[PDB]
């Protein structure tokens, strides 16, 4: 068994009220477990909808009591979870906080707290707060509230859950204006689609690990946990709302149990009473555990390719929890499952994998970092001088200590302009790289520049939008910081009103360059107007290609409108401005504007057959489209082919039957004589004779194809006899069925009769 422990150092009074709080939590979480038990089998739409709400209500109250654990954040010490000291982990965080509540947010973290409070009134006095799918709140936010003991923020009734803490979580994020890095934006993208997307799924879709997605439960980190921490610490604590919540929840917990009892009869023989849950607690927990072990073991095989026996071993030893395994040191994993290979361990523990493969650490040195900092994010969240203090006190080996420092430095030196000495100076002045990165995002340019080594290039790579503004001539460092802070980033500086920027001290040339209004100010002399059009429409091409009515409507004179559209003056007073523009932006220029069946009918007929391009080639070559149409009707193939760009393909599309004759091996001239003489390939097959085709200069081979005789010529019959055989009888098929003696009367030999018949 792994080590869970904690000692209570509060007074006797504080011991009593703390056990009171924890036991209420256990009782609330029993409701989560009991309702979960019922939800395993569906009933009816209205029944399990009522059951779901009850479930969520238990989740809220469990969360609320969890928030109340360790209010003064000093009633516990030496909080140990699975051999790991949580006191040291929470103290390293910039916001600190209760190590007890910190433990609760972890799976089975309640075990350390239950031991400290001597909870023995119930078999498995669990309090969990990691519900995802059925959580009435945004799951990450829910855990962060518990972490920060926000009794004031945690709702005590599903009906009183603010949308901004659930589906509309975006409203809460935008309300307090916190810095958000690129990775966090990628995560929020997924969560906007589905706020209740599991973190393993988010990681899978972003090509990240769970740890990268989650981050530390502190503002100075990166991930969804860090983002929510960044928001929540900005929300002032409401003591009155907290006390109202505390005043109401005990009574609410009883109502939920009364509701549970009545609703349970709708699902079972006997009601689910408080007494029933307590007595069957151990069996309910075991049932949950065994089915989690199965699912976990399968996942270890499917996703991580771990052997079955090893997977089953790991799953049981760690409560069927992948996230518990993924944060467990290699040695601890190998102690409970000796058959585990390092590659298998590196497969599930991405932190271990990265520390070894991407940072050349030994497994033992990596295990030090995992036990002390949990992940890379933990190292980045930790102040440099704190890591150095840990080394001096002999609580970190040399290999582990130096690797920590290198990881902390590399986070900054990967930026252009930042060397080791400058990176180190930034860490000593601002603690950790995450703080340094957040200062840049808050545009604290002067603050960062107070450090030696931090000049223009460093500021260009660290501070978002700084390089963009400082590139504009006449804008120095001081003004860049003012503009960035005032409007909240480069893009919003660029969106600011013209008059605003002028009174900020910017020149019209600077504003023009900022908004890219150059080509639009050339079109119209005003800058505000040019910006309004850039805003209202899209580009210079959009304003230019606008209808003339709307341009006059915008306040443009007809002189300007023609100038904008580029309409020359012999076109302006020749027509009205409406038609003058219509004709100009239809053709290239002025001189290109200088451009049984009728002419237009023949034109559109040609454009349908050979295309508009090839048709114009024909119209230009000859007199008109009516002349081309006259050649087509007379099967003048050769003369049509005299046109450059017009080959067999186009001619075949123009004159019917030509392709057929070309396929049969006839030259264009030969096909022309046939089409002229007979009119159509159909009438050729129906009426033309071999003697007539030989007159047109055709050889016996082509004639066979033309008359469709090759199905008889192949039987070593000549064209003449095949033609006569195909004529007297219906078709080629009918000849084969003809009487033998009837063939003999026609003069056919026994060998030819044999070839025909078989």
Distances (CA, A) of 146 to 69, 187, 198, 556: 9, 22, 18, 62
Q: How far apart are CA 121 and CA 537, in angstroms?
A: 71
Q: How far apart are CA 687 and CA 691, in angstroms?
A: 12
3-state secondary structure of 154: coil
3-state secondary structure of 7: strand
The single residue listed with the structure tokens 């003696």 is 741
Resolution of this model in Å is: 2.4
Residue-wise burial string across 559-585, b where 16 or more C-beta atoms lie within 10 A, e elsewhere:
ebbbebbebeeebbeeeebeebbeebe
**DSSP result, 125-150:** --------TT-SS-HHHHHHHHHTT-
Contacts of 330 (CB under 8 A, 6+ apart): 342, 345, 349, 352, 363, 366, 367
Residue 160: CB atoms within 10 Å: 10
Q: How far apart are CA 278 and CA 389, in angstroms?
A: 48
Residue 159 DSSP symbol: G
Tell me: is residue 268 an annotated ligand-binding position.
Answer: yes
Structure tokens at 301: 């095989």
Q: How far is CA 370 from the centre of its chain?
A: 31
Q: How many residues does the chain have?
A: 758
Helices (H), 362-441: 363-373, 376-381, 384-392, 398-413, 420-430, 433-441
To 10 degrees, the CA torsion angle through 9, 13, 19, 20?
Answer: -160
Q: How far apart are CA 529 and CA 535, in angstroms?
A: 10
Tell me: is residue 646 an annotated ligand-binding position.
Answer: yes
Q: How far apart are CA 137 and CA 150, in angstroms?
A: 14
Tell me: is residue 472 an annotated ligand-binding position.
Answer: yes
Tell me: is residue 235 an annotated ligand-binding position.
Answer: no
Tell me: is residue 470 an annotated ligand-binding position.
Answer: yes
Contacts of 565 (CB under 8 A, 6+ apart): 544, 545, 581, 584, 585
Contacts of 669 (CB under 8 A, 6+ apart): 637, 638
Give the closest residue to 225 by CA, choosing from 259, 249, 202. Answer: 202
**DSSP result, 589-604:** SHHHH-----HHHHHH
Tell me: is residue 449 an annotated ligand-binding position.
Answer: yes
In what helix (H) or strand (E) does residue 394 lie, and over which residues does it extend?
none
Structure tokens at 262: 């009545």
Q: Which residues pair with 81 in a beta bridge?
A: 4, 84
The single residue listed with the structure tokens 């589906």 is 167
**DSSP result, 312-376:** HHHHHHTTT-HHHHTTS-HHHHHHH-TT--HHHHHHH-HHHHHHHHTT---HHHHHHHHHHHSSH
Residue 457: CB atoms within 10 Å: 13
Q: How far is CA 81 from the centre of its chain?
A: 36
Tell me: is residue 265 an annotated ligand-binding position.
Answer: yes
- Encode 661-706 in three state secondary structure: HHHCCCCHHHHHHHHHHHCCHHHHHHHCCHHHHHHCCCCHHHHHHH
3-state secondary structure of 224: helix
Strand 4-8: give its sheet, edge to edge.
4-8, 76-81, 84-85
Residue 348: CB atoms within 10 Å: 23
Rounded (5°) CA angle 49-50-51: 85
Structure tokens at 471: 């590139």
Method: X-ray
Backbone phi, psi, residue 337, to 5°: -140, 80
Contacts of 87 (CB under 8 A, 6+ apart): 77, 78, 79, 99
The single residue listed with the structure tokens 């084969």 is 736
Structure tokens at 367: 């295990």
What are the boundaries of each domain within the chain? 1-304, 305-758
Residue 46: CB atoms within 10 Å: 8
Q: How far apart are CA 532 and CA 377, in angstroms?
A: 45
Give the closest residue to 464 by CA, choosing from 42, 181, 120. Answer: 181
Structure tokens at 92: 């390293």
Distances (CA, A) of 466 to 184, 219, 457: 21, 24, 10
3-state secondary structure of 431: coil
Q: How far apart are CA 661 and CA 693, in angstroms?
A: 13
Structure tokens at 86: 């949580």
Give the closest residue to 63 by CA, choosing from 169, 134, 164. Answer: 134
**What's the farthest any 2 CA atoms get from each other in the chain?**
131
Give the closest residue to 529 by CA, choosing from 553, 511, 554, 508. Answer: 554
Distances (CA, A) of 384 to 173, 220, 433, 450: 30, 14, 9, 19
Query: If you count DSSP H runs as helices and E runs as strands, how many of each does the chain have, helices first?
Result: 55, 3
Question: Please, are residues 253 and 28 in contact by the beta-carbon 8 Å criterion?
Answer: yes
Breaks (C-N over 2.5 A) in the chain follow: 595
Distances (CA, A) of 14 to 180, 285, 485: 39, 30, 46
The single residue listed with the structure tokens 């020359």 is 568
């Amino acid at each position: 068994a792994l080590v869970y422990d904690a000692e209570f150092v509060g007074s006797e009074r504080e011991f009593e009220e703390e056990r009171e709080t924890f036991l209420k939590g256990v009782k609330a979480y029993d409701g989560v477990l009991a309702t979960r038990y019922l939800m395993e089998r569906s009933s009816s739409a209205k029944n399990d909808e009522e059951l779901l709400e009850l479930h969520q209500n238990f989740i809220l109250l469990t969360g609320s009591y969890a928030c109340s654990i360790d209010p003064t954040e000093d009633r516990y010490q030496n909080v140990i979870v699975r051999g790991v000291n949580f006191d040291e982990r929470v103290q390293r965080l910039s916001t600190g906080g209760s190590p007890a509540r910190y433990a609760i947010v972890y799976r089975r973290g309640w075990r350390a707290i239950a031991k400290a409070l001597d909870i023995d009134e119930e078999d498995v006095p669990a309090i969990e707060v990691r519900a995802v799918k059925r959580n009435p709140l945004q799951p990450a936010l829910y855990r962060i509230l518990v972490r920060y003991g926000r009794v004031d923020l945690m709702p005590v009734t599903v009906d009183e859950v603010p949308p901004e803490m659930a589906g509309e979580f975006e409203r809460l994020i935008e309300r307090y204006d916190v810095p958000i890095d690129e990775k966090e934006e990628r995560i929020l993208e997924i969560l906007r689609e589905n706020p209740w997307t599991p973190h393993d799924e988010i990681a899978r879709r972003l090509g990240l690990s769970v740890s990268e997605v989650e981050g530390e439960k502190d503002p100075e980190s990166s991930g969804i946990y860090s983002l929510w921490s960044r928001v929540v610490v900005n929300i002032e604590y409401d003591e009155r709302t907290a006390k109202r919540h505390v005043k109401r929840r005990d009574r609410l917990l009883e109502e939920l149990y009364e509701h549970l009892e009545e609703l349970s009869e709708r699902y079972l023989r006997h009601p689910l009473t408080r007494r029933w849950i307590v007595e069957h607690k151990r069996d309910i927990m075991r049932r949950y555990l065994e089915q989690r072990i199965v699912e976990c073991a399968l996942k270890l095989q499917d996703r991580y390719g771990i052997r079955e026996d090893v997977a089953l071993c790991l799953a049981r030893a760690f409560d069927g929890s992948i996230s518990m395994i993924a944060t467990t040191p290699y040695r601890t994993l190998k102690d409970v499952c000796p058959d585990l290979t390092l590659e298998e361990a590196k497969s599930v523990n991405r932190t271990l994998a990265t520390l070894i493969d991407e940072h050349g650490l030994s497994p033992d040195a990596a295990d030090e970092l995992i036990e002390h900092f949990e992940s890379i994010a933990g190292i980045l969240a930790t102040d440099l001088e704190e890591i150095e203090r840990m080394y001096e006190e002999g609580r970190l080996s040399e290999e582990a200590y130096r690797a920590a420092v290198e990881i902390q430095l590399a986070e900054l030196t990967k930026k252009e302009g930042v060397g080791r000495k400058t990176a180190e100076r930034l860490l000593r002045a601002f603690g950790n790289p995450e703080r340094v990165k957040q200062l840049a995002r808050e545009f604290e340019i002067e603050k960062l520049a107070s450090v030696e080594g931090v000049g223009e290039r460093v500021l260009r790579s660290l501070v978002p939008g700084y390089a963009s503004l400082i590139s504009i001539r006449g804008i120095d460092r001081e003004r860049a910081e003012r503009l960035l802070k005032k409007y909240g980033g480069y893009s919003k500086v660029r969106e600011a009103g013209v008059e605003e920027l002028r009174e900020d001290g910017l020149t019209d040339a600077q504003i023009r360059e900022l908004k890219g209004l150059k080509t639009l100010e050339s079109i119209v002399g005003d800058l505000e107007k040019a910006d309004e059009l850039k805003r209202k429409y899209g580009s210079a091409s959009a304003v230019r290609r606008l209808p003339v009515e709307e341009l006059r409507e915008l306040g443009f004179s007809d002189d300007e409108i023609a100038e904008i559209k580029g309409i020359p003056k012999k076109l302006r007073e020749a027509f009205d401005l409406e038609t003058a523009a219509e004709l100009y932006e239809r053709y290239g220029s002025l001189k290109e504007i200088g451009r049984e069946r009728s002419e237009e009918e023949w034109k559109e007929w040609l454009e349908r057959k050979v295309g508009e391009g090839r048709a114009r080639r024909l119209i230009e070559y000859f007199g008109s489209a009516g002349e081309v149409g006259k050649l087509v009707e007379n099967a003048e193939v050769s003369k049509l082919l005299e046109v450059p760009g017009i080959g067999d393909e186009a001619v075949a599309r123009l004159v019917p039957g030509y392709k057929t004759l070309r396929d049969a091996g006839l030259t264009p001239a030969e096909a022309e004589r046939v089409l002229k003489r007979y009119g159509s390939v159909s009438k050729v097959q129906e009426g033309a004779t071999p003697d007539e085709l030989r007159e047109l200069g055709l050889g016996d081979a082509k004639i066979a194809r033309i008359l469709g005789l090759r199905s008889l010529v192949n039987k070593r019959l000549d064209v003449d006899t095949a033609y006569e055989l195909k004529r007297r009888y219906g078709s080629v098929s009918a000849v084969r069925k003809a009487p033998v003696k009837e063939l003999r009367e026609l003069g056919l030999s026994d060998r030819k009769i044999a070839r025909i018949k078989g």
